[PDB]
Amino acid sequence: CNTCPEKWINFQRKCYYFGKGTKQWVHARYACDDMEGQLVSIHSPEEQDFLTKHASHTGSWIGLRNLDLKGEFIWVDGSHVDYSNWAPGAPTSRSQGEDCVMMRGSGRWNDAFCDRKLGAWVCDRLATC
Amino acid sequence: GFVCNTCPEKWINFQRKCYYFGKGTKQWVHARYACDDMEGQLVSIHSPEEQDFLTKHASHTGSWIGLRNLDLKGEFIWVDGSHVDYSNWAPGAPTSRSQGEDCVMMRGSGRWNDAFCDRKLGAWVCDRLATCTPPA
Amino acid sequence: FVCNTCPEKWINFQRKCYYFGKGTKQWVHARYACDDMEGQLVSIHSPEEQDFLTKHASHTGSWIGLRNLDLKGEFIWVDGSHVDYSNWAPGAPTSRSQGEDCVMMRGSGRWNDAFCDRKLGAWVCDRLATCTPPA
C-alpha cells in the first residue's frame, strides 16, 4: 500500500505534497484540503527526516496549530504532539499570538503568526493499494 | 514525547482512544452493559477522522454506538454526556417524528440511523482512553 | 502524565509492572516466557523495588533477570544494566564460578546464584508501566 496520486511522493504508508506559492496558514490548510489532503502531521523522527529532505529551504506551513487558543498545539487531524522537533526556544511559552507552526529548511519547528505569508507548504494523505 | 497508543488486548488504537468491535446479538441496552463490563463505554464519535477509522473496522450489518435520545427529551446525547457536534447521519435520519426510535446504530458505510432500542444487532463498538509510553 | 497502568494480570509498583509467574522452568525457559508476554525477567535497582518483590515473592524461589553474561565473571541484568543495588544472600555469589551462572530470588527476597538448568516453580517478569495523559 504505497500508491500515491500523481505529483505526490510516498513514504511509509503516506503520500506527501510539497506545495509552492504564497499562503497564510489557514490558506495552506484549504489548499491541502483542495487536493483531498491535510497539512502534514509529524509523528516520528523517521518521518521528520524524510520531510527535511524535500523541505522548502525558505520555510513551509505544516499542520500544527494552537487549537482554539487553548493553548496546546494540536495537529489538523485531531492528533496530539508525541514526536516534536522545535527550534531552540520554540514554542513561545505563553503566548504572543504565534499560533501556527512552520517548518524551516533545517526541518525544525517554529511557532509563527497565522497571517504570515510563506512560499511553501506540505500536505499528506494515506497511500492507496 | 509520550506516545499514546497502548490499548488492552483485543482493542484497536486510534489517536488517544481504544476501540473494541464486539460481535454477538444485542439490543442497545445489553450492548451498553457489555461495554461497561469490559471497562469501556459505547463508542462516542467526535470527528471525521475518528469516523473514517470506525468505518474501516465496522461490521457490515450494523453496530450499536453510544448515541441516544435522552430521555426522552428530544436531543441525541452521547453516553459520555457530550452533545452532537460532528455527525454522520444517513439521509433523512434521525426522524423528526419519533415513535420510539431512540437509540443510534452505525451502518456498514459508517453512517448513522436512529433505531428502536430493542432491535437485535450483530455488533456494537466500545471505546476507552488509550495510555501512553513514556519517552525513552 | 502519571505512569502506573499495567496490562491485566500484572501488578504495578512505581513506574513498573510485574508478573509473578508459576510453573516449572529453567532460567532460559523463564526468560522466553517473559519475552512472550512482552516483558523481561525482572531487574532490580532499589530497596523499595526489592521490598515490593519480597511481598509477592514465591516461597520456593524465583528466577530473576541477573546472569553471568556469556561467562565473563560479571553478573549483568537482562535489560543490559550493571549491578548497582544488590541483595545477595550470605555467601552469594560464589568467588570462582563452578557454573552457577544464573540468579534466583528466595521467598525472603535475597539473591542466590544457581545453575541455569535448575528447574524452579516460579519466575518474575517486569516491563514499563503506561501513563495516563493529563486530562
Residue numbers in the entry:
A (entry chain B): 160 to 288
B (entry chain A): 157 to 292
C (entry chain C): 158 to 292
Authors' own words:
In its membrane-bound form, CD23 consists of three CTLD “heads” connected to the membrane via a trimeric α-helical coiled-coil “stalk”. The interaction between CD23 and IgE is critical in the regulation of IgE synthesis, which can be up- or down-regulated depending on the oligomerization state of CD23 (2, 9, 10).
As expected, the two principal binding site derCD23 mutants, E249A and D270A, were unable to bind Ca2+. In contrast the E249A (principal site) mutant, which crystallized in yet another form, has cis Pro-250 in all three independent copies. Here also, loop 4 adopts a similar conformation to that observed in the Ca2+-bound derCD23 structure (and conformation 2 of the Ca2+-free and S252A structures). Thus, of the 30 independent copies of derCD23 presented here, 19 are trans; of the remaining 11, four are cis as a result of the Ca2+ present, and 3 are cis as a result of mutation of the adjacent Glu-249.
